């Protein structure tokens, strides 16, 4: 029996694991463990795939979150019961900012809270922020791979107007930022994330696999 | 479109079926369409698993929702873009309510919105409720093979934890809203607590579909005897029969 | 004295009866009476109309409600101190679907809520929906004098756009419903809901005539 | 339209009247109206009955308002339809402050908006205020009886009920929102609570119409000692007399 | 050191003064002084300028709030913290109805509550209500140097539409009164408005000059 | 425009300054200016002092907020279109976490928006978030100085008193949504409360402009010690070097 309701895992499968990367799916998880040294698939039920690596000798955790801020609760509230305390996103998104370019990478400071789950973890007043050393260490990783940056706020909704959030300034959409950024600020967990551009309506494969680079090598300043 | 991105689907290979049987986990739903005709595996992508089969000579389909809302936002939408007009959930849950035993059934009626998704398809004033037909055929359909059945409203929450009030966590704590929301749910009559009905009632509700819920009941937090491990397995194959049984009926 | 602050009714008014019939006025009270058995006035004060009268044997209460929810929410804990646990309600209303006519009868199944009575009794995100037996009890009652059906979802506000409700579906407007069914499906009495369609902006008393006796045939099945 | 649906009167009825007292009985407006002079009943339908009156010479109207906001709305829009510029609302209440005691006088100088029918003639952060020219003639008129007058906050509730924390019940349990609400008010200073006029007030604040209200006070739920019944029909003919004596005033 | 956090004074400075008129600036707390007798200027820290003088032999404070609720929350807190039971605000704005005139003086009964610090006093339905003596002393003071008044609805918020409030009947607009009628009228403390009215956007020194002596006067009555 | 009504300054008074370092205190302009090249008085007016000076060559601005969101607003938005594009919050603060000392210094990632202010400029769900290249240099200029740092939430309030659920005051009471709001922040983490950045960094998060914040913690009400009122003043010119030698790396 595993000691969490849904991952399927034991305390002892993480050896000591403090990080978790947690992408979106399975097939990203795969991709990032790849990156690091002894990867370890440890389980899989239904949304949550989660493999075990190593980092400069570190073991570190990569855990699928599934679609949406439900189900990534359920993911991040489990590995911390399990012991993570830092949590990086990962993913790839569609610009909106008409000076932001595919293949740049996006560094989320905070987003803008449109979901529900968020709700469940704090008011709509407190600030789905990320945690300064993990945005700076995001920071640091993209400019060690020449990647071009920028650094600022995320849409995050429940749904899969477009000029209102830009003109505001947010950078790009998805699901389940303000789940984990909320979730993380509130409970002394600390999260950041990254995201690679591979649309921007206002190469592709590359864009996702410089921005599994950058998750790994934020990682490893942050252990 | 004539394809859908998610299911990675046709509408040809649906063959006209208009009913859909969603469970949460794609792990069961080849076991549901093994209980129908002609069964086949049309698709399987992420957490969308579907099957067709055949039901008393009508083609029907069985396709996971995954967890969550927007999850099965995404699964409601494209179904429905590929013809499915009505959806019968069927899962497995905990109940909240002391008189509601492990083996019971509970058909839901309508379900307290707590959740982000369903908002999306009304305003919260619009009641999450399941159409009539659709429950009918599965109050009918428990009572043919015998159930124990409780016919109610059920809370539909965005977390497993917080909003289902769990203190057995990391923090060990609930946000100021949800403190106490449990107590104040089970004195309103709410039977259980699950995940994905309030995003799929109000769809279907507010966009002229069918679409009713089944659930077994495999623990009851508010018990102190723990399931016999034995007829949680039992109650999901009990519930099974009763969705399938159900379908027969909306035919 | 009576054993209510406004109904002006002991509890052995009621002789036993655990099922009322709530519409709106005295005029229609007094007409649903007429249908049953032994018939008796019983009380009359303000907005509110007590009749008596019985079903195969049994007593059944028949009680006017008065406008809005915030009369009705005084009806309906009154009748339930005085042991009521069923209420089955009885009204006229104008339809909003292009596809239900005049003389039709709109059984609802859960209620818009858009009044402000509804919120006292549970937060919005509680539905306000009808008993399942009580809205299977109409339905047969309808199918059982031939009458066309439609069960569906109302709109209750406190007002005496018609277009998003209408997309929606909703089949009509009133303005009781909401506090009835959320009061009663929130505190464990049993409430169902029946009108009969006199307007269509999208042959009249008939319609009402068989409304009235849907809700009676529909409390005979429920006692 | 030269006619009313709900109250059942035309424009000529009234006399060109442009004041009205309005009760929520109707039982209660024939002895209001006979306190002035030519008192004549008008109509009477449903809740609604009105008659009218000449004080000092001028057309005066009296109609009940029925119970709660929906049902005021819909005199109060009738009457400004017919010409009525000018409301005073005169009822009986309960207290909730322990200085105050039975057959003592409130007087309204807004509400707290604990309802839904406000809602529709103004946002919740619009104030349900009371007209000072009315409360003034109302104030005014309570001195020159000698009643001891409170002039402050009340809280319009739309039940009788949970919204007034009352826990003598069916179920014996408030809603969320609403538990501990009548100490919070009562620290905050609210009078008492009553139905009607949020909608009243707003509706008039809104749309350029004079609004004012009067109550006298029957019974005192922190008070141990059960009120005269006695004193308590003398605080109703009390209260007939100030709102009276203010129309004569607003003339 | 004062008894206070933030107006640098001792209950002894106000040697029993119960009430203050609370102007938004300093500049406006001298010329208020001006017209009183034994004005002594008490404090001058940040927004807050604190002068003490005399009306018919009784002191009276008069104290500048600063910008907004905020400021003015700590002002009417503080002041009432050193025995202030009564307060009066004078300003000047600018009023949004045909029918008012530039000169006219604007005593409001109840301000539209859409600024935030209100809400920390008491929910959005709580009334902003001026306290009825304070109105009426107001009102008899504006009576009796001849000038044109209005009383009504303000409109506060925390911005330095239009045609809403109009057909609402809000005379003006200021950021003020919400917070101040709130935190007054929820607190047992008794408040009061009047502003002159300089400009009409549907002289000006001299309509400022009124709007104090009223103030002034108004004091007077309620002292 | 080429002059602002509150600030009392044209454009060309700045000389093409394009940062200003914001305290809330006028008084405080002057010291912050001194501290750096030919600091010379622009104007004041109100609580709105402004001085300009010289950081390596480059023109900077010193100008107070006052106390609040409405006018602090005020202050930002002038100097924004006077040409300034980044907007360094300096302040002094209390702490409510009791693992933060006196004498410490908070650099702010985001504000709890209990504000009214912040809300014109964008919807309650927008972050209240600060420059990350204001944040990243004032944090190392912390660490430059040697001084301990907290780096996280601060909850910006619109009182004083019941928004930091003070009890010691006239009333003794907070309204309900404000009852142990303290307490939830703290177990969020939440290092200290203050009245202006929610609207500071609401507006320039939403306006393309950069803004950060740094505050010397000069008390702590969760912790028995009282300051050493010595340590307090230290505590004020350590935050003052922060924010000018931040100044310096954000040129």
């Known amino acids: 029996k595993s000691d969490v309701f849904h991952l399927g895992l034991t305390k002892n499968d993480l050896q000591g694991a403090t990080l978790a990367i947690v992408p979106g799916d399975p097939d990203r998880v795969e991709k990032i463990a790849a990156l690091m040294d002894k990867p370890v698939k440890l389980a899989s039920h239904r949304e949550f795939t989660t493999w075990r690596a190593e980092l400069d000798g570190k073991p570190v955790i990569v855990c699928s979150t599934g679609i949406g801020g439900p189900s990534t609760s359920i993911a991040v509230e489990e590995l911390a019961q399990l012991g993570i305390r830092t949590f990086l996103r990962i993913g790839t998104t569609g610009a909106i900012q008409p000076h932001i370019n595919v293949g740049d990478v996006l560094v989320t400071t905070a987003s803008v809270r449109l979901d529900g789950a968020s709700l469940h973890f704090a008011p709509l007043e407190f600030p789905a922020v990320a945690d300064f050393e993990c945005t700076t260490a995001l920071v640091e990783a993209a400019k060690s791979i020449g990647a071009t940056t920028h650094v600022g706020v995320t849409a995050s909704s429940d749904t899969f107007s477009?000029?209102?959030?830009?003109?505001?300034?947010?950078?790009?959409?998805?699901?389940?930022?303000?789940?984990?950024?909320?979730?993380?600020?509130?409970?002394?967990?600390?999260?950041?994330?990254?995201?690679?551009?591979?649309?921007?309506?206002?190469?592709?494969?590359?864009?996702?696999?410089?921005?599994?680079?950058?998750?790994?090598?934020?990682?490893?300043?942050?252990?």
């Open 162 to 223: 477009m000029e209102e959030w830009q003109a505001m300034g947010v950078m790009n959409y998805e699901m389940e930022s303000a789940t984990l950024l909320t979730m993380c600020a509130s409970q002394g967990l600390r999260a950041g994330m990254v995201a690679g551009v591979i649309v921007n309506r206002t190469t592709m494969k590359q864009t996702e696999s410089h921005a599994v680079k950058i998750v790994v090598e934020a990682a490893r300043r942050l252990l």
